[PDB]
Write a protein that binds this DNA or RNA. Structure first.
Ligand SMILES: [Mg+2]
Ligand SMILES: [Mg+2]
Length: 89
DNA sequence: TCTTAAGTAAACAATG
DNA sequence: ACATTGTTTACTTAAG
């Protein structure tokens, strides 16, 4: 990991959850998927975690689920994330 | 232009 | 006593 990913935090989260076996992921698990699949953030300046939690709460695309709690993709905005994913892969 | 997405920092409350 | 998690405001840059 030497360069910043071309994907935005919204897409990284979407790729992490979508790769999950159940489309549901706690925050810390989302951290890992971003690290394992993107090692740039290993040496990246602290704050991307913050930017992640910031992105999960106000982005209409993600909705919490409580029966840390799990995050999932919103079915009505899922089409929105895929489009941004195809743009710059 | 008017608008919105996006990144980052910072400040908390709620959580266990 | 504490780190994690979650919400909120604020200033900035790029894109359309
Ligand atoms: Mg959300
Ligand atoms: Mg930017």
């Amino acid at each position: 990991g030497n360069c910043k990913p071309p994907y935005s935090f919204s897409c990284l989260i979407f790729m992490a959850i979508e790769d999950s076996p159940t489309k549901r992921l706690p925050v810390k698990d989302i951290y890992n998927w971003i690290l394992e699949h993107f090692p740039y953030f290993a040496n990246a300046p602290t704050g991307w975690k913050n930017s992640v939690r910031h992105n999960l709460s106000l982005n209409k695309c993600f909705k919490k689920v409580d029966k840390g709690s799990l995050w999932c993709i919103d079915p009505e905005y899922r089409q929105n994330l895929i489009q941004a994913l195809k743009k710059t892969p």
